[PDB]
Amino acid sequence: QISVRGLAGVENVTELKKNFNRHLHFTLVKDRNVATPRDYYFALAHTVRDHLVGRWIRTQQHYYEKDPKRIYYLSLEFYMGRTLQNTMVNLALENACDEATYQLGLDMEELEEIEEDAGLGNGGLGRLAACFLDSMATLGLAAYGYGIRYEFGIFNQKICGGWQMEEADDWLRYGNPWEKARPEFTLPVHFYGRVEHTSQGAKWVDTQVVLAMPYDTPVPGYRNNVVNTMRLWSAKAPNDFNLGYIQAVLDRNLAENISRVLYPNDNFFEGKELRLKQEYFVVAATLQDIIRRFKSSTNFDAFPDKVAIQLNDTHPSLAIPELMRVLVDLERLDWDKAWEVTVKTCAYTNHTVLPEALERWPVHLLETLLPRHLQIIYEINQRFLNRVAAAFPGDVDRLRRMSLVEEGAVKRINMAHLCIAGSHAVNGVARIHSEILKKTIFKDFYELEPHKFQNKTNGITPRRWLVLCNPGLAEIIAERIGEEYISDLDQLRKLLSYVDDEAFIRDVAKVKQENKLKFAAYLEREYKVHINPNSLFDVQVKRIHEYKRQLLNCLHVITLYNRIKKEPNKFVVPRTVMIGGKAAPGYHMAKMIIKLITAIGDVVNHDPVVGDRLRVIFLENYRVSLAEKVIPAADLSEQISTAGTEASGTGNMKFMLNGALTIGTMDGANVEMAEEAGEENFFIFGMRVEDVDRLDQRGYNAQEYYDRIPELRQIIEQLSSGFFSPKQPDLFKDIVNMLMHHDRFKVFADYEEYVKCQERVSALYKNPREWTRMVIRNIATSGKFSSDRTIAQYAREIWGVEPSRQRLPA
Amino acid sequence: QISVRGLAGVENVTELKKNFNRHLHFTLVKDRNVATPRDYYFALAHTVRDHLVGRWIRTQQHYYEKDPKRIYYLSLEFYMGRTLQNTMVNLALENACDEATYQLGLDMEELEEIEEDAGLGNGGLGRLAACFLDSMATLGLAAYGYGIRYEFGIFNQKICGGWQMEEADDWLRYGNPWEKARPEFTLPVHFYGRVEHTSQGAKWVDTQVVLAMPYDTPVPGYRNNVVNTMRLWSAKAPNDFNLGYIQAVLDRNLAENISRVLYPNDNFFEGKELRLKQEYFVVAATLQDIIRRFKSSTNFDAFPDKVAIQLNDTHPSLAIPELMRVLVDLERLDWDKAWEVTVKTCAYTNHTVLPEALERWPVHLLETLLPRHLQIIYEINQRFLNRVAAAFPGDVDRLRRMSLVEEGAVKRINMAHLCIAGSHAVNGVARIHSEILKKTIFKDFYELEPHKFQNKTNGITPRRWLVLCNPGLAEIIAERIGEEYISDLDQLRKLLSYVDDEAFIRDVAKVKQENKLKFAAYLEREYKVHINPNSLFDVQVKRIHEYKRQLLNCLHVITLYNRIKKEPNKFVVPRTVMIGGKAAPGYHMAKMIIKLITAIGDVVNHDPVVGDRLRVIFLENYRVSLAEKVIPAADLSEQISTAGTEASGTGNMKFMLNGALTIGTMDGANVEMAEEAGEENFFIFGMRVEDVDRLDQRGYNAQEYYDRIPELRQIIEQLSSGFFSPKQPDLFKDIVNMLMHHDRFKVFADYEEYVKCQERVSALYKNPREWTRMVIRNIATSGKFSSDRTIAQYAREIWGVEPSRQRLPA
Ligand SMILES: OC[C@H]1O[C@@H](c2csc(-c3ccccc3)n2)[C@H](O)[C@@H](O)[C@@H]1O
Ligand SMILES: OC[C@H]1O[C@@H](c2csc(-c3ccccc3)n2)[C@H](O)[C@@H](O)[C@@H]1O
Ligand SMILES: *Cc1c(COP(=O)(O)O)cnc(C)c1O
Ligand SMILES: *Cc1c(COP(=O)(O)O)cnc(C)c1O
C-alpha cells in the first residue's frame, strides 16, 4: 500500500502464506474452522519470528568471530510494548505480511491489537532502555540488554467510580512467542550467609541459593540484518530447596517470588527487601554471564577493553561491589587492580534529583542479605574518603557529605555515591539536568573528578515512534526526502524547505486529521465515549505525579469551564482535553488527582451550556500501545513539570516527532527542543530553574496567589465546597490543603502565565495554515531527539566503540 | 534393523532429517556447533510430534461428525513415563527415526534417555490410567483422560547413607513438547462461600474463584491413526485476585498451589484440605467441559447415552454430587430425574480393601470448602437409607453400616459409600478382589443391588510393556507368529507349539541374557556397581509397603547369607537380589525397610566368603523408565503380598510378559496368572485368604514362629544385636518390635513355605532348558493381562460402546 512499509513480492507473499498455514496446523494444532483471531495472531507471530532466527544466529556467531567490545545495558526495566509490528518494520516485511494476511481474508491490524504489551517498566526509564536496545541494534553495536523477566509487569489500570483499581498484568497467560528459554545457562545466585576470613582471604558461606534461568528475546536492527539479545532472568528454586514434604515443595514459591512482580513506583524509592533481592539477582546472574563470555575469547587487564557495563540509574549499583567480590574473592586479584578494572568497566546514568527517588538502603538490610558486599562497600568508602581528605585537607564537612554511608537514626548506603566512586563516567539525561548535577547534588564529586561528568540528552527510536505508530506521516515525509531519515533523523531538517509548500502543508494537516478521526473512533469502540474530532486535542499522558503537575492542567480546564459559564454565547476554540497515566498504588495524592480529573469530566462533559466546546477525558490504562495511538492524534503536548524536576522527559520528544506543538516549562529536554525549533515555535511559559530558587529563598506563600488571582480563588472555593463532589463535599480537602500549605511544586506560581500561554495556543489554532507551518518547523528540527544520536554519543564518549550502519549479510 | 520397528523408506528418512534440522534451527534457535544432546532430543521430539498433529485434528473432527458416546476417565494420577519412543512405536516411525538420526551421526537411544518421565502418579493406579488411555486409543474409543497437570510429580529418590532423601521432580524445567496449552478453554472452579435458599431453589454464593487452564497431550493408538486426548488442568488465579499491591500479587500462589504437587502416598489416605481442593478442582473443571461438549451435539435424558464417566477409585467421587449440583441448581432438573442421569452416567472402580486407604473426609472440611456438596450428600444419604429401610425393614444396624455419614468423635463422609450409591457399576480389579468386595466391605451394598458389582481384572499395554521395553523378545515372537499379537495378545498362545522347538528355546534364553548384559552395564555406568550377569536376577520392584512384604524378601536374603557363612564351600545358585521402590515421605516404617535393605547389602556385598554368589542391590528412583529396563532383565518376579491385601498388582503382569518366572502368594491377579499358565508353571507358596482368616480368628502369635524356626530366631537375634548396624546396635528395634508384636501382614507365617519355595526356584535355575520351557509357558499364556482385554470388558459391560480395530484414514 505505502512505500516505507517495503515490497510485497509474489514469492515473499506465497511463502508467508505457506508458513502461516504450517504454524496454524503444526504449531497451534488448530484447523481454519475453529481458529480465533488470537490463533491467527500467533500463527503470524511465529511466521515473522522465523525470519528473525537466521539473522539472530549469524549475528551472535559474528560477535564470537570478531570478538568486538561488548556493551551490557543493566536495567530493572525494559518497557518493550508489542514486538510483532516492530519486527515487521525492521525486517521490511510489513507490506508482504499485510498482503499475505489480506489474501487469507484476515486484517493484520486486527491481529496486531491482540498482542499483550511486554509492560516490564513504569514509564520514561523503562522505555528509554527499550529505545536504546533498538538504537544499539540499528548501529551494529555488540550490545545485550540484561534484566528480570517479571511474571507480572506494570498493573492494568481500571477506573471504577472515577477511582484507579489495579489488576495483575498476566502478560504470559497465552505464552510469549518472542522469548527463547535457555534453561541450560541457568546460574546460581547467593543470599544471606556470613563471611569467614581465612589465610586465603574472605569467603561467603552458608548462603541460600536461588537459580537464575535466562529467557532470550531478539532485538532486530533497522534493515541491517543485526539481531541483538535481551536476556531476562527468571528465579527458580534448586530441587533440594527445603529438602514436611508437601510444604517444602510449596515453599519453593518464596525463592521464585524474586522475579514475580515489577515494583510499580515511578521516580520513587521503596526500601523493601524483595526490591533489593531483585537488584542483586539481576546483577549476580548478569556478571557471571559477562565473565563466562569474556573467558571464552586469566588476564583481567583487558576486561575493560572487552566489556562496558552501563548502570540504568542506581537500580543495578550492586554490579560495582559484585564485580569487586568476584575479582578479589574468586579470581584472587589484589584490591587496587580489581578496582581499576571495575571503574574502567562501569558507567552510571543518573535520571533524577528528587530526594525521595534516590536509593538509600538501610545498612541492617545489606548486613543480613549481602554481608560480603557491605564489607566491600565500607572498604570502597574508606579508600574513597582518603582521596577526598588528601585533595581537600581539613574539609571534614565534605567527608560527611561525600560518604557512601549516611549517619542518622538508621545508617544508609547512598547508592548514587557508590556509582560515582565506582564509575569512569556519570551522565545526566538532558543538558539542564547534567548542569543541575554539577551545581547541586553532585557538586562535591564534580570538584574531585570533573572528568567523570558528561551529558547524554535522551532520545526516542524513530522506528516505533514515527514509522510504526504514524505510517501516514512517515510516508508524506518519504515522498519528499526519501527513506534515509528513518536511520538518520537529522535529515528531517530538509523539511524546512517545504514550510511554504502548499501541498506539503495540506498533507501534514490531512495526516493529523486522519490520526484524530482514527483515535476518536478507537475511543467510541473500546470505551463508548463521544468526542468532536474538529476540536484541539490537548493531551497530557505520563505517570501521575505531583512534580508533572497534572493539577496545573486541571486548574486550566476548570478556568476554561468557568469562562464558558460566565459568557456562554462567546466563541472559544473547542478542545478535547485528554489526561492519562497510572498512579503508584500506594501514592495517595496521585490517586486523588485521577479522581479529581474524572470528577471534572463528570461536571464538564454533562453541562448542556458547554456543548462539544470542552470535553475532559481520562485515558484508562496508559501504556506503550495506547501511546502509539494517542501521540499521533495529538495537537498540543503538555510538558508542564516545575522547572528542575523532570530530568529529561521522552513523551515530549514523541509528540514533537508526530506533529503536536508543545506547551511547556524550561525543564528537561524541553529546553533543547525549544533551542532546536526556535523559542518562537514553542509555547514556553513559567518560572525558570533560577526563578524557582528565588522563590525558595524568600519562601513559597500560595496564599499570595489565591489572594491576587480572583479566577484562582473561584476554582479553590469550587474544589473546597463540593462543586465537583456533591455527595462528598470534602472529598478534595487533601488537594486544596496541599495546594494552599505544602505544594513542593509551586502549581499556583505558574498558573497566571500558563492560562495566558494557553490563550496563545487557542489563537494560533484558529489559523490552521500558521499552526501547520509551526508544526512543520517542529517535525523538521526533531532529529537531535533520535536515540541513534544518544547511543552514538554513549558509544564514542563512554563505551569507546564506533557505531556502524553497514548491513550483516542475510 | 528389526521388523516390528517398521520400514525406513528413503523418502521417510530424508523427510525426518529435513524436519529435524528445521526444528534445530527455527524451533530451538541452535546451529549444529553449539547443540547439546538435549537440543538433539528436543528437535527429534518436535519432529515426531509433527506426525501426531494431522491424526489428532482428524480424530477430534471425526468424533464431532459421528458424535459417538464419549468415555471420560477421571483420575488424580496418570503415570505416563516417557512419550517419544511410545509415539514412534504407535506411528511405526521407530526404524525410520533410528535411520534418520544415525545418518546425522546421533544415537537415538542416547537421546531417548534425556526425556523426563511424566511421573504424575504413585504406582499401580496411576500407571493403570496410562495403560488404559493407550488401550482406549488402540480400540478406537472416543475416550478422554482428565486429571491435574502437577508442576511436581512423584519425588526423585536419592539414597544417602542408605536412607531415602526426597527431591522435587521439576519435570517441566526444560519444557514439555508433548502438551498444548489451551488457555482459551479456561473454566472457573468455586470454593468456600455459603448456600442461600430462594424461591428458585438453592444458590452457592460468596465463593472464591480458581481458574482451571487445560493442557492437552496426544494419546496415539497402535497404528490405527487414532489420537485421543489427555486433558490436564492447571490452577490459575483470576487477575482481580486479592485486588497492599505487591502482597496481593504474591498471594496469587495460594490459589495456584492446588495443582503444584502430587501427593506421594500409595494405597494410603491423608485427609488434608489441599488434597480435597485437588479432588474438587479436577471434578469441577472436567464436568463443565463434559457438559459444554454434550450441549454442542436441554434434554438430559440422552446424557448417559452420550457420556460415560469412570471414577478411578474415590479420588474423583465428588463428580457425583457435582453432577447433581449442576443438574438440580443450574439446569433446574428435579432431583429424581437428575439422580437417574447421574447413576446411569457414573461407574466406580475400587482398588483396595486396606482400611487406611479408604477416603473418609471429615464433615467440617466439606462444610467449609463445599457447603452445597455436603447438603446434596446428606440428601443422597437420606434417600439411599430410605431404600435400605424398605428392603431390610427393622435392620437398624444395616442402616448405620451403609450410611454415607460415619458417626464418631469426628463425623466423616465414606466416599466409597457415595460411589456405590451414585454409580450403575462398581468393579474390583482382579477376580479374588471383586469376590472380597462382595463378601466383606461391600457385602451390604451387594445384597441391596447385586446387579451393580462386576469384576474387571487389570491389564498392561503390550506396546510399552513388550514392544517398546523388550524389542528383542517382540522380534523372536514376531519371527514365528507375525505382528498381529501386539494388538491381540491372546495370539501369544500360538507360542505353546514352540515349547519343544530348540531354536526358539535358544532365542528366548539369548534375549534374556542380552537384556541382563544390557542392564548390568546400565548399573556400572549410572551407579558404579559390579553384578555377575550369570546370576539369577531376583527382582522385587514396587512401592515400599508393609503389605507388599519387602521384609519377607529381606528375611530370605539374610537366610541365604547365613547358609553361605555356615557352609561356605557348598554350591548355591548365584543370585543378584534387586529391591527397588519409593516410600511415602511420612511413612516411617517404609523408610526403615529401605535402610535395612541397604544395611543387608553393606554386609553381604563386602563379605569375601560370599564372593559373587549373593549380591543385594537397592535400585534407586524406581519409576516407569527404570521399570522398562529392569523388568526385561529379570529372571524371578517377587509378588509376595499377604493374601487379600494386593487388590490386583500390575508389576506381576509386566514380568510374566517379559520372560520372568513368578514367586508369589495367591493374591490379586497372581491367582488368574497361575490359572492361565498352570499352577505347575508358577512358584505359589503361603497362606490363601482362607488361611489368613483362620489365623485372625485364633490370633496371630509371631512368638510361636520365632520359637519353632531356629533359622528365623538367628535372623531376629542378628537384627536386634546390631549385626547389620554395628555403630547403631538398636537401629532396627522398631522393625523387630513390629515383626514380634504388631505385624498386620503375618511375615513370619509365610517364612518357612517362602524359603522352601525359593529352593525350588534355585533347583529349576540349574536346568536352563526346563527354566526356559517354563518361561515360554508363561509368555504364551500372558494374553489375558493385556489392557486391550480389560478396556473391551469395561466398554461392553459398563460403558455400552463397541471397541473397533478399524484404522482412521491418514
Ligand atoms: O531518563 C528517562 C526518564 O527517567 C525518569 C526516572 C527518573 S528516576 C525513575 C525511576 C523509575 C522507576 C523506578 C525508580 C525510579 N525514572 C525521569 O523522571 C524522566 O525525566 C526521564 O526522562
Ligand atoms: O488397580 C491398580 C492398583 O491400584 C493400587 C491402589 C489401590 S489404592 C491406591 C492409591 C494410589 C494412590 C493414592 C491413593 C490410593 N492404589 C492397588 O494397591 C494395586 O493392587 C492395584 O493393582
Ligand atoms: C514515553 C513514555 C513515557 C514517558 O513519558 P514522560 O512524559 O517523559 O513521563 C511513559 N509511559 C509510556 C507508556 C511512554 O511511552
Ligand atoms: C507397574 C508399576 C507399578 C505397579 O507395580 P506393583 O508391583 O503392581 O505394585 C509401580 N510403579 C511403576 C513405575 C510401575 O511401572
Test A26 with B50 for CB contact under 8 angstroms.
yes
d(CA A808, CA A55): 8
Same domain, B412 and B500: no
Tracing cell 542391590 back to the chain, one arrives at B617
CB B402 within 8 A of CB B308: no
Test A166 with B243 for CB contact under 8 angstroms.
yes
Chain A nearest-CA residue for B240: A167
Other Cβ atoms closer than 10 A to B464: 25
* Nearest-ligand number for the alpha carbon of B352: 2
Q: What is chain B's length?
A: 810
**DSSP alpha helices (H): ranges in B403-546?**
415-422, 431-439, 443-448, 462, 471-481, 502-527
User: How many angstroms away from the CA of A114 is the closest CA of chain B?
Assistant: 13
Q: At residue B168, what is the residue type?
A: A
Same domain, B157 and B278: yes
CA angle B182, B188, B191 (to 5 degrees): 140
CA angle A42, A45, A51 (to 5 degrees): 145
- Residue B202 burial (10 A CB sphere; 0-12, 13-18, 19+): middle
d(CA A235, CA A148): 9
Phi, psi of B485 (to 5 degrees): -70, -25
Structural domain total, chain B: 2
Task: Kindly list the protein residues whose Cβ atom lies closer than 6 A to any atom of ligand 2.
Answer: B 122, 124-125, 128, 265-267, 313, 351-352, 357, 429, 458, 646-650, 668
Test B236 with A274 for CB contact under 8 angstroms.
no
Other Cβ atoms closer than 10 A to B759: 9
Q: Whose CA is nearest to atom 22 of ligand 1?
A: A649
Tracing cell 545418518 back to the chain, one arrives at B103
> For residue B110, what is the enclosing H or E element?
helix B108-112
User: How many angstroms away from the CA of B566 is the closest CA of chain A?
Assistant: 44
Same domain, B799 and B766: no
Residues 6+ apart with CB under 8 A from B106: B40
- Quick one: angle between helices B502-527 and B471-481, nearest 10? 170
CB A134 within 8 A of CB A80: no
Question: Coil, strand, or helix at residue A173?
Answer: coil
Write the DSSP assignment of B450-468 as a string of letters: GGGEEE----B-HIIIIII
Test B54 with A25 for CB contact under 8 angstroms.
yes
Of A50, A166, A245, the CB nearest to B155: A245
CB B797 within 8 A of CB B452: no
Mutate to test the interface with B, among A179, A243, A276, A296 (most CBs of B within 10 A): A243
* Nearest-ligand number for the alpha carbon of B549: 4
CB-based burial, B491-530: b 16+ in 10 Å, e otherwise: bbebbeebbeeeebbebbbebbeebbeebbebbeeeeebe
Test A249 with B181 for CB contact under 8 angstroms.
no
Give the atom of ligand 4 at the shortest distance from the alpha carbon of B627.
Answer: 15
Task: Answer yes or no: A69 catalytic.
Answer: no
Rg from Cα positions in chain B: 27
Judging contacts by C-beta atoms under 8 Å, the chain B residues touching residue A156 are: 239
Same domain, A45 and A143: yes
Test B250 with A257 for CB contact under 8 angstroms.
yes
Most ligand 1 atoms within 8 A of CB, residue of A261, A272, A351, A460 to mutate = A351
Same domain, B301 and B237: yes
- Residue A589 burial (10 A CB sphere; 0-12, 13-18, 19+): middle
Across-strand partners of B71? B143, B308
Domain coverage including residue A529:
460-786
Of A168, A272, A586, the CB nearest to B239: A168
Task: Answer yes or no: B654 catalytic.
Answer: yes
Q: Dihedral (C-alpha) A181, A184, A185, A188: value to the nearest 10 degrees?
A: 110
d(CA A570, CA A578): 23
Q: Whose CA is nearest to atom 4 of ligand 2?
A: B125
Q: Give binding residues of A for AMP as ranges.
A: 31, 64, 292-297
Residues 6+ apart with CB under 8 A from A200: none
Test A261 with B249 for CB contact under 8 angstroms.
yes
Give the CATH number for residue B733.
3.40.50.2000
Judging contacts by C-beta atoms under 8 Å, the chain B residues touching residue A31 are: 57, 61
- Cell readout for B79 is 503415570
d(CA A35, CA A40): 7
Task: Answer yes or no: B543 catalytic.
Answer: yes
Angstrom distances, CA of residue A587 to CA of A264, A269, A593, A617, B530: 10, 12, 10, 22, 68
Q: Which method resolved this structure? A: X-ray
Mutate to test the interface with A, among B246, B247, B266 (most CBs of A within 10 A): B246
Strand order in the sheet with A360-362: A360-362, A412-414, A405-406
The active-site residue out of B542, B556, B582, B615 is B542
Task: Answer yes or no: B565 catalytic.
Answer: no
Task: Kindly list the protein residues whose Cβ atom lies closer than 6 A to any atom of ligand 3.
Answer: A 123-124, 127, 542-543, 623-624, 627, 649-651, 654
Cα B605 to chain centroid, rounded: 32
CB B566 within 8 A of CB B558: no
User: How many angstroms away from the CA of B57 is the closest CA of chain A?
Assistant: 7
Q: Looking at residue B152, what DSSP letter applies?
A: B
Test A174 with B167 for CB contact under 8 angstroms.
no
Same domain, B260 and B351: yes
d(CA B553, CA B550): 5
CA angle A241, A243, A248 (to 5 degrees): 75
d(CA B491, CA B483): 10
Q: Dihedral (C-alpha) B629, B632, B636, B641: value to the nearest 10 degrees?
A: 60
Expressed in angstroms, the distance from the first to the final Cα of chain A is: 25
Judging contacts by C-beta atoms under 8 Å, the chain B residues touching residue A155 are: 245
Same domain, B648 and B693: yes
* Nearest-ligand number for the alpha carbon of A126: 1
Closest C-alpha to B804, from B13, B68, B92, B44: B68
Residues 6+ apart with CB under 8 A from A497: none
Task: Answer yes or no: B194 catalytic.
Answer: no
Residues 6+ apart with CB under 8 A from A238: A188, A209, A210, A211
Task: Answer yes or no: A443 catalytic.
Answer: no
Judging contacts by C-beta atoms under 8 Å, the chain A residues touching residue B174 are: 181, 183
Q: At residue A15, what is the residue type?
A: E
- Quick one: angle between helices A371-391 and A415-422, nearest 10? 70
Q: Give binding residues of B as ranges.
A: 31, 64, 292-297
Ligand 3 centroid–CA A551 distance in Å is 18
Same domain, B716 and B803: no
Q: 3-class secondary structure for B643-691?
A: CCCCCCCCHHHHHHHCCCEEEECCCCCHHHHHHHHCHHHCEECCCCHHH
Other Cβ atoms closer than 10 A to A674: 19
Mutate to test the interface with B, among A245, A293, A621 (most CBs of B within 10 A): A245
Closest C-alpha to B176, from B45, B355, B329: B45
Same domain, B544 and B560: yes
Q: Whose CA is nearest to atom 2 of ligand 1?
A: A125
User: How many angstroms away from the CA of A261 is the closest CA of chain B?
Assistant: 7
Mutate to test the interface with A, among B18, B25, B26, B29 (most CBs of A within 10 A): B29
Of A53, A174, A253, the CB nearest to B253: A253
Same domain, B582 and B518: yes
The active-site residue out of B51, B351, B575, B777 is B351
Same domain, B437 and B475: no
User: How many angstroms away from the CA of B187 is the closest CA of chain A?
Assistant: 14
Residues 6+ apart with CB under 8 A from A545: A266, A267, A590
Chain A nearest-CA residue for B61: A31
Tracing cell 516407569 back to the chain, one arrives at B624
CB-based burial, A508-539: b 16+ in 10 Å, e otherwise: bbebbeebbeebbebbeeeeebebbbebbbbb
- Residue A142 burial (10 A CB sphere; 0-12, 13-18, 19+): buried
Same domain, A441 and A581: no
Residues 6+ apart with CB under 8 A from A242: A248, A249, A251, A252
CB B780 within 8 A of CB B493: yes
- Cell readout for A504 is 506539503
Test A241 with B168 for CB contact under 8 angstroms.
yes
Other Cβ atoms closer than 10 A to B613: 19
Q: 3-class secondary structure for B274-320?
A: HHHHHHHHHHHHHHHHHHHHHHCCCCHHHHHHHEEEEEECCCCCCHH
Most ligand 1 atoms within 8 A of CB, residue of A76, A77, A132, A267 to mutate = A267
Q: Dihedral (C-alpha) B237, B239, B242, B246: value to the nearest 10 degrees?
A: 100
Write the DSSP assignment of A112-152 as a string of letters: HTTSPPEEES-SHHHHHHHHHHHHHHHTT--EEEEEE--SB
Q: Please work out whether the CB of residue A639 comes within 6 Å of at least one atom of ligand 1.
A: no
Angstrom distances, CA of residue B148 to CA of A227, B137, B151, B209: 40, 20, 9, 17
CB A348 within 8 A of CB A419: yes
Q: Please work out whether the CB of residue A352 comes within 6 Å of at least one atom of ligand 1.
A: yes
Ligand 1 centroid–CA A128 distance in Å is 9
Q: What is the resolution of this structure in A?
A: 2.4
Closest C-alpha to A225, from A804, A741, A734, A687: A804
